[PDB]
């Protein structure tokens, strides 16, 4: 919420990526044009995560799937929490009650909401400066 950043997942070591086709996943390549994210804080602990390259917003739908939304909406807001270990976790606001976390599998694919939970390394992200 100031300058663009990278969201590094400690699980497989991938950077969160939102592709032009709206798909979301992780990549180990730091030169990727779609891993630079701009976070903006809506309210305290509530944030939007937007791809700087395409302007698409991270979002999670009712099926628990992550997608890239061309326009911000209710499914684009995440609860950003700072873990004691130093990593952050991002919970779906719309489904906060269900504890649906943003997460990347060791193979770099995105996890589905009900299959995430506190304890997995898949849900831990390290925001890293782009510059």
UniProtKB/Swiss-Prot annotation:
Name this protein carries in UniProt: Fibroblast growth factor 1
Residue spans crossing the bilayer: none
Result when mutating residue 111 to A: Loss of LRRC59-binding
Resulting phenotype, residue 105 to E: Reduced integrin-binding. Defective in integrin-, heparin- and FGFR1-binding, and defective in inducing FGF1 signaling, cell proliferation and cell migration
Subcellular location: Secreted; Cytoplasm; Cytoplasm, Cell cortex; Cytoplasm, Cytosol
Consequence the record notes for mutating residue 80 to A: No effect on integrin-binding. No effect on integrin- and heparin-binding, loss of FGFR1-binding, defective in inducing FGF1 signaling, cell proliferation and cell migration
UniProt organism field: Homo sapiens
Region of interest (Heparin-binding), residue spans: 105-121
